Amino acid sequence: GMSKLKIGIIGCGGIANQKHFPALKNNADLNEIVAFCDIQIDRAEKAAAEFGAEGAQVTADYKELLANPEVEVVHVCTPNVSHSEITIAAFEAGKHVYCEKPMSHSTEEAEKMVEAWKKSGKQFTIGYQNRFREEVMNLKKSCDKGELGEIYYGKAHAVRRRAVPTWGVFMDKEAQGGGPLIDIGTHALDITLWCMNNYDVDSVTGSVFYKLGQKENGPEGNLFGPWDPKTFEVEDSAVGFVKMKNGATIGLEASWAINMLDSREASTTLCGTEAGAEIHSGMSYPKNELIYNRARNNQLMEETLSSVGSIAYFAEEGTVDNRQWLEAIQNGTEPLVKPEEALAVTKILDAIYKSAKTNTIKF
């Protein structure tokens, strides 16, 4: 064995509760957390009564959770504009830090927290846990062996027909900075680049729509109940067009509300010189799908996942994301999600937003 890892958690809510806390508990052999911050201390204490170890810290404001020099790693499950604050310099006053999903809504703040990190000495990672799904790994591994050839056309799918989240921070334009483009669209673009392993941006064009978000009959049909139409501060959909310096191109579609039929998110579509591939996931897909396509021995074929069943008496990615995170600081290696990659992601989404000036942004 080897001691343990003393974890500090900042912000206890939606994805501290649905992803982060269960992830750590199912790897308790490597972690146990005292932490339990939040501006609202009511929740902070409750978590530390379920997942906090034998007598622990429970601060009401982070600045002194970071004081305790026995905590060694921090999980920033803030909202988005606090993502910079609680992380940049603040947390790396002597810690490794796991910041959540959209690294930051701003590119400058993101560039600040990568330099605060590069002097940290410690380690850093972002919550793109979808990389750890078995089929995304499968596709990533395939593109690493060049079995798709060289990818010259990619698509990032992050579409929802009417699945606007009405339960938390995602609609406060000030707390998260943007709408579905940086909510879910950041997941799909991360995989697309990661498999293509192309991060050298040249140009960016985009369009941001504000159409169903303010229509009276807008919330009609939304999965998560109605929402106040006269208070929609973000967008309902956005579409992107990014050209790389090797010539490759990526199209992006992101939305919470749009009258399209195929709700496909956390997915991508790659087109190489030897083969292609597409991943399927979202509201219209009860099971995640992976389909290669190529010409083999002069016939067009397609290779997909086979249906896995159970036996008489015998028979995930959030846990795999987190476990790999701890063993990373433990054995002293690199986590899978690299900080510079999440940086490339946010600066393009930002660039797609900044095409709110109706002009293509060259990099």
Ligand X SMILES: NC(=O)c1ccc[n+]([C@@H]2O[C@H](COP(=O)([O-])OP(=O)(O)OC[C@H]3O[C@@H](n4cnc5c(N)ncnc54)[C@H](O)[C@@H]3O)[C@@H](O)[C@H]2O)c1
Residues annotated within the binding site are 12, 14-15, 38, 40, 43, 78, 80, 83, 101, 129, 167, 176, 187
Q: Is 310 in the site for a second copy (CB under 8 A)?
A: yes
Question: Which listed option, ligand X, a second copy, none, makes contact with residue 202 (CB within 5 to 8 Å by class)?
Answer: a second copy
> Is 284 one of the binding residues for a second copy (CB under 8 A)?
yes
Which of a second copy, ligand X, none does 78 bind, CB closer than 5 to 8 A by kind?
A: ligand X
Closer of 181 and 248 to ligand X (Cβ): 181
Chosen from a second copy, ligand X, none, partner binding at 83 (C-beta under 5 to 8 Å by type):
ligand X
Token representation of residue 314: 């015998």
- Pairing verdict, β 285-296 and 276-282: antiparallel
- Which option in ligand X, a second copy, none does residue 308 bind, with CB closer than 5 to 8 A by kind? a second copy
Query: Is residue 132 a contact partner of residue 320, using CB atoms and an 8 Å limit?
Result: yes
Say which residue the tokens 């940290």 belong to: 120
Q: Which of 185, 159, 181, 192 is nearest to 268 (CA)?
A: 192
What residues line the site for ligand X (CB under 6 A)?
10-16, 19, 37-40, 43, 62, 77-80, 82-83, 86, 100-102, 127, 129, 167-169, 176, 183, 312-313
**Contact pick of 55, 296, 332, 357 for a second copy (by CB under 8 A):** 296
Token pair of 220, please? 């009609």
Q: Which listed residue (79, 178, 272, 339) binds a second copy by CB under 8 A? A: 272
Alpha carbon distance 199, 191 (integer Å): 11
Rounded-to-integer distance, Cα 138 and Cα 136, Å:
5
- Give strand ranges (E) for 112-248: 124-126, 153-158, 201-209, 237-244
CB of residue 356 to ligand X, shortest distance in Å: 21
The DSSP letter of residue 131 is G
Of 259, 178, 260, 282, the C-alpha closest to 212 is 259
Cβ proximity to ligand X, 78 vs 222, nearer residue: 78
Binding to a second copy, residues 20-59 (CB under 8 A): none
Phi-psi region of 342 (alpha: psi -120 to 50; beta: other; left: phi over 0): alpha
- Pick what 200 binds: a second copy, ligand X, none; C-beta below 5 to 8 Å, kind-dependent: none
Q: Which residue from 127, 162, 363, 149 is spatially nearest to 255, judged by alpha carbons?
A: 162
Binding residues for NAD(+) are: 12, 14-15, 38, 40, 43, 78, 80, 83, 101, 129, 167, 176, 187
The contact pattern for a second copy, residues 128-167, with x = CB under 8 A and - = no contact, is: -xx---xx-xx--xx-----x-x-xx------xxxx-x-x
Q: What's the start-to-end Cα distance of the chain, in Å?
A: 48
Q: Does 314 bind a second copy (CB under 8 A)?
A: yes
Site for a second copy in 62-101 (CB under 8 A): none
**What x-and-dash track marks residues 196-235 binding a second copy by CB under 8 A?**
------xx-x-x-x-xx--x-x--xx-xx-----------
The span from the CA of 146 to the CA of 148, in Å, is: 5
| 168 near a second copy (CB under 8 A) | no
Query: By beta-carbon distance, which residue lies closest to ligand X?
Result: 13
Can you spell out the DSSP letters for 272-289? -SS-EEEEEEETTEEEEE
Give break positions in the chain: residue before each, C–N beyond 2.5 Å: 315
